[PDB]
């Protein structure tokens, strides 16, 4: 939701930097001389940065040795033809993937780097055993968080950079926040007011603060492990967590979004389902054996996945996640009832609890002070007749001096 | 536009539930024993849910029977090598697609499920004949709406769930609503005000209500058939359609969006093109044989595709769709002319017609109360200085009590 609050970064900037270093003279020969003996080595470039180096395919030692002497010529066996095809197919597929993705591909395909080669690279990376273990057990995630930048093809050697991820934060507690509109449940149309928490997404403890990811679609989840990317994050204070237990806390101004659009929807959570059933919409929660087990009343309610298989809102049928865990229902008055609908700002996106309360303080000023000037319309007096003698104010008119 | 009004759902939740059922002990043996005779069968799991089961590739009865006895060892036929390669290539490509997409792929590829096997599953699915017909003629769309979750590879068998779509609503009338900014056409720069309908997207009749899809890019079209997904939809009453014929109807409060950004644009519709030409922008409509046939005046206008091939707005060139059909132009006064620019709220997202009327009634309240009260009031009467003497009003002045 709050994805616009994020910064803008260059993903392949590091790999491209190493790429521009590889264009320099002699830089490629250092690698070719380092891998002249073994297939894997560690090489320090001109600028001192040390990078891993790997030789995955040697068509030179195949075409120049096993294929060249035959090339008047004649082929004697057919097995060498299929052997050459098997050797060349990898280069062909890599060429295809690059020629489509303009030289930068992501995720890293198996043609670009097989599982054996990827696990070898992880084994020799200058990181901890915990990091090697994490990257080795989740190679599918490492492939999805890596790039493949094609660099140069000089001096009978081909070169491309594999930009691998570094997991500097591991095993700290995380939690995912789900939100849904909280509207009133009046009968008249458009008379309802709505309010929605906007701080939804992933939160993880990191360096005495919290890393917030507003677009949870970009965070990949495997088992109870959450692989997020700090590039799509916000560094918030720890007090953000207070918004869950006390949205009216003074130490942090919780972000909301106000409107008048009372439409029904549902948000499938990790262990259940939130259902916002407004209007004449019919919302139910059902089990695969007996059927409907709850018909939601108008409002925002919750249903755990313990014994529930589907949740239907209107014409939409959601399957809830059947993950094992304990769901706790915390009672509470819906805060939308604490508000007066006559001074409720209905056009608020990038809002907060205090920002809306201050916009209410102004409207209370505008109506209780300035509009009540209507009371001073009939409450004041007109000019008495500009006649001979004097007039006194009796009843609602100027009635002279007979009374004298 | 209104995509934020949608809920959040889990797509593979059903397939993942069935997958977690397959992790249980003995379930794999039930599946392995059911397919011992035929290649496809129907199996009811422990929880009673009945699912179709398919064995698409049998490498067991090839490696152990046709390949094992040859492995002193020596291969006699060379054709058997290529035969094994043709049999194994499918497993290799399935492995690639899974290892890249982290175990969940969409659309379902031909390696994952060939056309014959997919039509077999559709033919043996327990649904109506009309659903079989629909899914059989549009396998490309069914693939685009299906998932492939890799489950387990236990006890000499490979298993993955293919999550296929069920089209429970077929052949009901649908319609696509296109919108474009409707601004004034003043000559001054910042004096213009703009208004745009947000109800753009797909609408379909369903169960006495309307399924609304705000992100029409996700709905796929083949011929006059529209394959949408209820997951990203909204259940609206039928009265929403009134917004097309009567934007000021009382039974539904139509959603709009106000601004002051009068920029020129064009919206290519199904049978024509809407052109909003504001400012000094030059917008034309041209035919490939004759050339320019219309120079748009400042405002929002329409052009049918009957005889028109391209429409240019500024430096942007649009090709109109050449589908056969009748386009009808309904004249009418642009509603933006019904508004006063001095009381027109310009900062408005997620608004409605009555929501604009409420702020306009409020602004007129402060104006009709301020200028009509201050002027009628302005000519009141001051008081005589408080000097312990009572004054009476004569000749527009305060004279002290002069009686004896």
């Amino acid at each position, epitope marked *: 939701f709050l994805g616009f609050l994020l910064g803008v970064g260059s993903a392949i900037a590091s790999g491209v930097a190493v790429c521009k270093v590889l264009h320099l003279e002699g830089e490629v020969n250092k690698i070719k001389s380092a891998l002249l003996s073994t297939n894997k080595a560690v090489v320090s470039l001109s600028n001192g940065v040390s990078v891993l180096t790997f030789k995955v395919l040697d068509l030179k030692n195949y075409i120049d040795k096993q294929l060249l002497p035959i090339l008047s010529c004649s082929i004697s066996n057919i097995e060498t033809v299929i052997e050459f095809q098997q050797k060349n197919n990898r280069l062909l597929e890599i060429t295809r993937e690059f020629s489509v993705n303009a030289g930068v591909t992501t995720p890293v395909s198996t043609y670009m780097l097989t599982n054996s080669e990827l696990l070898s690279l992880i084994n020799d990376m200058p990181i901890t055993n915990d990091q090697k273990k994490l990257m080795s057990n989740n190679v599918q995630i490492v492939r999805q968080q890596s790039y493949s930048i094609m660099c140069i093809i000089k001096e009978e050697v081909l070169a491309y950079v594999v930009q691998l991820p570094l997991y500097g934060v591991i095993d700290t507690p995380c939690w995912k926040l789900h939100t849904s509109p909280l509207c009133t449940t009046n009968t008249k149309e458009g008379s309802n007011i709505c309010l929605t928490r906007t701080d939804r997404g992933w939160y993880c403890d990191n360096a005495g603060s919290v890393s917030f990811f507003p677009q949870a679609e970009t965070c990949k989840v495997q088992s109870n492990r959450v692989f997020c990317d700090t590039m799509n994050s916000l560094t918030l204070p720890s007090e953000v967590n207070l918004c869950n237990v006390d949205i009216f806390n003074p130490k942090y101004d919780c972000k909301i979004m106000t409107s008048k659009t009372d439409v029904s929807s549902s948000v499938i959570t990790s262990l259940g389902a939130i259902v916002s059933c407004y209007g004449k919409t019919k919302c139910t*929660a059902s089990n695969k054996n007996r059927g409907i087990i*709850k018909t939601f009343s108008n409002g925002c309610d919750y249903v755990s996945n313990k*014994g529930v298989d589907t949740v239907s809102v209107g014409n939409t049928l959601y399957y809830v996640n059947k993950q*094992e865990g304990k769901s706790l229902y915390v009672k509470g008055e819906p805060i939308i009832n604490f508000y007066d609908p006559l001074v409720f700002p209905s056009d608020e996106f990038d809002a907060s609890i205090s920002q809306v309360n201050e916009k209410i303080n102004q409207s209370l000023a505008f109506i209780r002070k300035s509009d009540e000037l209507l009371s001073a319309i009939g409450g004041y007096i007109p000019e008495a007749p500009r006649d001979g003698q004097a007039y006194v104010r009796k009843d609602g008119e100027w009635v002279l001096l007979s009374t004298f | 536009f209104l995509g934020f009004l949608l809920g959040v759902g889990s797509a593979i939740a059903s397939g993942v539930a069935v997958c977690k059922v397959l992790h249980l002990e003995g379930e794999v043996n039930k599946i392995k024993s059911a397919l011992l005779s035929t290649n496809k069968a129907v199996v009811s799991l422990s929880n009673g849910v009945s699912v179709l089961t398919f064995k698409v590739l049998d490498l067991k009865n090839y490696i152990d029977k046709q390949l094992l006895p040859i492995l002193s060892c020596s291969i006699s036929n060379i054709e058997t090598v290529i035969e094994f390669q043709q049999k194994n290539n499918r497993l290799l490509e399935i492995t690639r697609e899974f290892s890249v997409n982290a175990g969940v792929t969409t659309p379902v590829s031909t390696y994952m499920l060939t056309n014959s096997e997919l039509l077999s599953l559709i033919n043996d699915m327990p649904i109506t004949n009309d659903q079989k017909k629909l899914m059989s003629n549009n396998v490309q769309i069914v693939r685009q709406q299906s998932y492939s979750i890799m489950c387990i590879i236990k006890e000499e068998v490979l298993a993955y769930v293919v999550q296929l779509p069920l089209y429970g609503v077929i052949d009901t009338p649908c319609w696509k609503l296109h919108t474009s900014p409707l601004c004034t056409t003043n000559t001054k720069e910042g004096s213009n005000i703009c208004l745009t309908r947000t109800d753009r997207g797909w609408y379909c009749d369903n169960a006495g209500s309307v399924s609304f899809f705000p992100q029409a890019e996700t709905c796929k079209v083949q011929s006059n058939r529209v394959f949408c997904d209820t997951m990203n939809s909204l259940t609206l009453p039928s009265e929403v359609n009134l917004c097309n014929v009567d934007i000021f109807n009382p039974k539904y409060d139509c959603k709009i969006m106000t601004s002051k950004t009068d920029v020129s644009s064009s919206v290519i519709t199904s049978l024509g093109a809407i052109v909003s030409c504001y400012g000094k922008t030059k917008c034309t409509a041209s035919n490939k044989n004759r050339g320019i046939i219309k120079t748009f005046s400042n405002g929002c206008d329409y052009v049918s595709n009957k005889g028109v091939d391209t429409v240019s707005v500024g430096n942007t060139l649009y090709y109109v769709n050449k589908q056969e059909g009748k386009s009808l132009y309904v004249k009418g006064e642009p509603i933006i002319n019904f508004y006063d620019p001095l009381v027109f709220p310009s900062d408005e997202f997620d608004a409605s017609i009555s929501q604009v009327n409420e702020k306009i009634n409020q602004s007129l309240a402060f104006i009709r109360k301020s200028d009509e009260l201050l002027s009628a009031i302005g000519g009141y009467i001051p008081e005589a200085p408080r000097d312990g003497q009572a004054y009476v009003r004569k000749d527009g002045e305060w004279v002290l009590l002069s009686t004896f």
Partner: antibody
Amino acid sequence: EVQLVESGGGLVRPGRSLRLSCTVSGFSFDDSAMSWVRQAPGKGLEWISFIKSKTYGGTKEYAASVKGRFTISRDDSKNIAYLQMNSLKTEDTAVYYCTRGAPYGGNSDYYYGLDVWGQGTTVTVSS
Amino acid sequence: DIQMTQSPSSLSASVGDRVTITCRTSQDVRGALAWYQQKPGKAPKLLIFDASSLETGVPSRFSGSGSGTVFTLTISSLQPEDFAAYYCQQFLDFPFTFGQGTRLEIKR
């Protein structure tokens, strides 16, 4: 944290009355529904009574063996649930457990099992 | 009322064996069963709810299956802690009647 403690058991003459009381501590008592299940000495489990949440009408459902004789009630102000046993027979000598019925979701009038169980209190009905 | 029938009433088995208790109901309970484990003197413990759903904290050796009328509780690998009594309970409508129970003894 979650605890159910039943009290009020003991000796009682055949034909009189005795009130069992289950104290709940650890979760919201008003939102949940309570049940009474007894086990006779040497015999199996027998489901006795059930009272639904305040949200669902406070509906008391009894078993055929104790219908008209037993009466279930709840006092949500102090988180306690009573089982009034009137016109007691000698067969009512048993261990009485207090349980909490678990709704098919977080909150639903369809229940799938008995989540929490008290340790039970022994009631002996003999002259 | 709905009649419950647990079979068998006694089961003799050794440690590490695979055992299966059956619960027959009189009607189609629409998968509204429950399995409880009661050790002698102590309160029963809910193991499986709905038909096969496993309660939190229950080992993987406990399996629930069956549908409609016949339901089975299965212990894959028996452990010395699993020797107790087992009851099935219906949750379709009131009364939520219990089963007779199944006594589990050690084979000797």
